[model samples]
Target chain A: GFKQDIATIRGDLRTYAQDIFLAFLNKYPDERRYFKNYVGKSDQELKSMAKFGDHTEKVFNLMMEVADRATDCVPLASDANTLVQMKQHSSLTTGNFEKLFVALVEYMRASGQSFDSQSWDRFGKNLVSALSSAGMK
Target chain B: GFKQDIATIRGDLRTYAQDIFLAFLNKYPDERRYFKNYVGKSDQELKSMAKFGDHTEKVFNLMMEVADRATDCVPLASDANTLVQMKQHSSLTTGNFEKLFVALVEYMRASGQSFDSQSWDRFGKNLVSALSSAGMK
Candidate 1:
């Protein structure tokens, strides 16, 4: 059911990925400097840029991968979305992970889509725990 | 110091008030319906509407009021910004209050203004606790 819920929102998430990505970046400014290809871009410009879109897609895809496996977030401990790469470059925080989910939920809700918080909480808690055990935060 | 920081961002907040307000609405969709004048309006229209601007200003002003008294958030328990009105209309949550501050912080950060979280946490925690004790949340 959690996976199914995640599926229903896939299209919507894709449609608003830029908004969600900007919201995530807003919540975590430290990550902005790492977007070298996106230098001096306004939020409007960032929406149209390929590098920014690619990065946002990767982050959302990683989120999808984790949400899809809410029952077993173990595999996320090793993935191509580069949680490891992110960690290698800078410190990650459990708090940051928590708010990404919040950003998605907020975006979804703002767009007039209803959401189930229990599903999100289950997925969020498990993924964070899985990542923490693997030294993400 | 917190008051000064709050003052410095006053113009930015006013300029971006609609953006911040919409973000807040997205983060807490249940609160959206309370804006009767904004019914069936698109986000673009909502940005240009007087009722929406009036409502957003009140909320931000209340936030400023509390932030101004970060050292003593006691006065916030008796404000016109309508925490009382909100509580009367529906249930409130501590989580909601926390994320409102997060929305403000995120918006400020994304817009290229550097912020000090320590001041926010102090103001936020004090205000929330004050509101909570007043039974607003």
Candidate 2:
């Protein structure tokens, strides 16, 4: 039931990527080169961006896939390898990965999904840990 | 594309399985023990029987799943092993294998589905071949 709670909101997650992009841009302007194509669009312009939405949906879709598979029995352990790679954005410092995950958590909360920190502990804590360890930063 | 063929007829497959029961019972009355529960049901009684219907759907569901997976760039070669076991539902020589497989093919025909040998050879021939090699028989 809880795995499903996150899945039904993939549309919401698509928007989450955009919000996360803004958070990154707002707080970490030094990373501007990372979002060359995505930067400087009108507010409406940025939201129309399908590439950002696709990346976000894929990120969380895999999480949901792994979570459902977790209920099944055995799935690929450390299946977050690709997710970790995503965290880096080519070259990442420790700061960005945690920032990325936390931005997602914040977006999830403000977006009206009732799933809480308890669920995060169950579902996401290890993911952030994996990203942290995997990043060169 | 072939997986799409089987998927469209999942409902028809429910009945096709019942047809196989009749085919088995009619052609080989001696094999009555093979269908202890499914026995004695005519075409009229057979498809209506929920247990028989469920079992039939499952058989093809498994086959459809494997067949679809087969067309993927990385089809699970012998991982259709469950389908293989489904084949060796105790004992079967080539005759019954063709019998069961062809019953399905004929069932598809009468059920008003469109398909041909080249299609069958791609999806099914390899399935039978796999079991022949795996040797659960």
Candidate 3:
């Protein structure tokens, strides 16, 4: 049951991430120019800018690690021996996932990243919609 | 660089999930019995308890999806060009991750499986610690 919860959480996270990215791009059209300009820089210069790049990379890497670990932490409902066990395990697993999710947010904040609350609300609504749809299937 | 970040984030998420699970079990002694009893139940019986188990499965699946998508959402930071793209992409990706995490929490809450702030705090701390350790390597 725990594993199943984690899996669903992961899917929702992916959808959330993709949708948010699209929205950000839509909101910040000028941002693309930065990527366009940076793409043509020399490797040596890119390396020199490693100081800046490294920290950003560090933040990026940490985010990915959290996501991966969360995935691995999922516990399977099929493994439970009774309905009670499944319920308890499911509750425990969902609780843990919530904790991890918050932690990911803190990590982002600590790294100087701002969170989008409105976007998050939308994502949550969409997630519920998605989960409901999945449940029907 | 994006790949590296994704790997690190995934690793942290996995570690945190395990740590929280262990702690949760310790706090709720009856959990062992719950799992122990449920393993032999018939599918129909399990389905009777589907309200809880089904949601748990969904959450787990979503977490896995997030991890898998992290790999594909790599935002480069090697140079000015990459950095620009990274910034744009990172902003979007990070926002998405945040929203997804929150949405998962809300889902769990709606299901009567919410975590306390302290639990979330601990989970976040552990996750960040894991990420830092990973970064050192």
Candidate 4:
């Protein structure tokens, strides 16, 4: 199912990444400095500087492990991402994560893609379940 | 006297202006996007882009009128500055203004000028009075 969703986007990970970047910048202009393209002059800055493409997919892959209930790789993938986020962004607040949802959904529509709300919603439900199981808010 | 305090910093209104700007940006790094030089880059950005130079002098000039009990000129100076701030920064929040006090006093330490504490304190108190009288928190 997750593999089918990825195919729908035809691996246009970069475009989706750009949309998430724009949505976040628009929604929280105050936090723009956190992004690499704090200048907003180029897409490369958002992709390379802000960890857009890499972050989007690696974690998406982890969710692949998660959504499939692939217990063998689940803890290994999820724990690693969680550990890195905690270490790298200790300053990040809950408000930051809440906005990530909007960034994800918004670009899905603007990207000329049907947003596949069906798929996004299922993925989110699983993400929330993982977060809850992991004792995160 | 407050006039004498101004005289201490080489009587440069601009010095005080710079101090005020540093204080706020340091205090509220998150909201910096609202500023023209949000990035605080070198070359005309930090000084020229933000309201540090322009706003400080204009508002200080208005407070001068209020403090001297010189109402004849108070409304003129104060209203003009107020109008510009209102028009340009329509999105600024009330919570933001409440912190101006922190910026003013915090920068006093590095102002390279001794605040006579006596006179500066009186000046600060009166300014707070003016702010309160003007219906600001």
Candidate 5:
């Protein structure tokens, strides 16, 4: 059932990822410093970049993995490698990652994507648990 | 003819003004510092401010006036008063004002508003002439 529910969102996963990433940058423009390739680029320029597309796929796949692991009753210890890879350099705070997650949920609602919040809620809780146990905030 | 052409855009002037202003700030978040009341405010907070509404009307009315005077063969010297008032403080560069005009045109196109570019062209030329004569860039 969780798989089926997530399938609805995955149908346009690439577009969704692009929109979510852009929205996050739009809302918190200062965060763009962490994305060196995106610096000084217009919206059209950012959309055209191969690097931006690659980064979007990374973000998209991470969320998909988080959703796929949503039903598990155990810790998200297996997701550590993905999380570490997602962090860019060491300067970004966990709070920024938290905000990205918040931006994704908001973007989904604004764009009329039907999502099962219970699945997200369960995944978010375990993700935080995993991050904290791994010496992250 | 210019007045009638611009009337189509005026039908939803308030909303158009709000959207244009927000889009400008969204594209150039650093420019928010120029509007002291808008600094550090959320999008909702900026929308809810009476000051923001007042400023939006100021921007909207100026463009409407510019369009109304588009047919005149004479210079826009009379518009100096309006342009002077439009500048928030001396610190804001003419480049920012230029960007705001650009943003307004872009927003109109994105929102599917049918507009006469001829009227806009005539008005913009005169507006620039007016601003330069008034010791503004």
Candidate 6:
């Protein structure tokens, strides 16, 4: 029963993440560039970078931690885990940007609240700014 | 672009509906009795019934309207009109209990801006109660 419940929750989460990400992207088109630059790199290229590569690992690790915590309440398919792992490995693929965007939107939607463009933009900017600042240091 | 955005928004709205519904169900398990009994009824029987058939339709219609309005800023799906028709055709299977539960948790996560299981459960229960009261009417 719990597993079933988690599965349902995960579905809802996926949908929510998609919504939030879409809204965020719409509000801040420039951030897409950031995501594309940072998360859309090949593993070899990401590893070679001094600043961004290490930052990418940190961001991916943090995101996975968030996912792990979320999965504590919602069971995920092994395939879903594989998707996350692949995204983590690549961390800079255009596909990863889309997936991450979808995941964040899903997480937001799962929360059951509506976010306007302004709020969505703020959140997106904050998220990217945090990452960028971390990378600089 | 608009269509894609609306689709994304609509997807999120569906996620919101599921989350809200699940939270309500957890708080009022008795509500499941209402859905379970109505789940397998024929369309004619549903339309004839006073409580569920019309009430369900009304709720579904309201939900679609919400999605439509959301599309003004976001690109939902182009076949947005079919949501009501598809819902009517598959009324019995329309209830996404699992998604609702997951949504409740996700809603709590995003709105709270942090993770707190107890708070989430409380919020979920409150949301469920609101829906239950609405359904009872």
User: Compared with the true structure, what per-residue lDDT tens digits does model 4 show for residues A18-95?
Assistant: 555556655454455564334423334345655567676554555444444534223344643473366545555545
Q: How much does candidate 4 score in TM-score?
A: 0.37
Ranking by TM-score: 5, 1, 2, 4, 6, 3
Give the CA lDDT, 0 to 100, for residue B54 in model 6.
46
Q: What TM-score number comes out for model 2? A: 0.41
Candidate 6 per-residue lDDT over residues A1-137, each given as its tens digit:
32343244345553333344444444333344555553323233433657544454444444444344443333234423443445434344334344454445545455654433333333334334333333311
lDDT of 4 by residue, B29-117 (tens): 76677765457464345667556577757756654444344231123335434633565646654455546646666666555543433
| A90-115 per-residue lDDT for model 2 (tens digits) | 57654665565565565556565575
Angstrom error of the Cα, residue A64, model 3: value is: 31
Error in Å for residue B128 of model 1: 33
Regions of model 1 farther than 4 Å from truth: A36-40, A72-82, A85-90, B1-137
Report the lDDT of model 2 for residue A107.
53
Candidate DockQ values, in order, are 0.03, 0.01, 0.01, 0.02, 0.05, 0.01
Docking level of model 5: incorrect
Interface RMSD list for the candidates? 11.9, 22.6, 13.2, 21.8, 15.0, 12.8
TM-score of each: 0.45, 0.41, 0.18, 0.37, 0.50, 0.22
B17-77, model 5: which lDDT tens digit per residue?
A: 7887899898888888766767778778888998887878777877776655544423356
lDDT of 6: 0.41
Candidate 3 segments exceeding 4 Å error: A1-137, B1-9, B12-15, B37-61, B64-137
Which residue pairs clash within candidate 2? none
lDDT digits (tens) for residues B1-137 of candidate 1:
23334665575665566787777777667666555766566788887887777777766776676565444323355542356466543656666677777776666556655454545665666667766676665
Colliding residue pairs in candidate 5: none
Question: Residue-wise lDDT of candidate 2 within B1-137, one digit each (tens)?
Answer: 24335455564666555565566556666665656465665666766767767776676667656655664212365654554566447565545555566655555556543443235444455666666676645
Q: Going through the candidates in order, state the TM-score of chain A alone for each one.
A: 0.71, 0.63, 0.24, 0.57, 0.80, 0.28
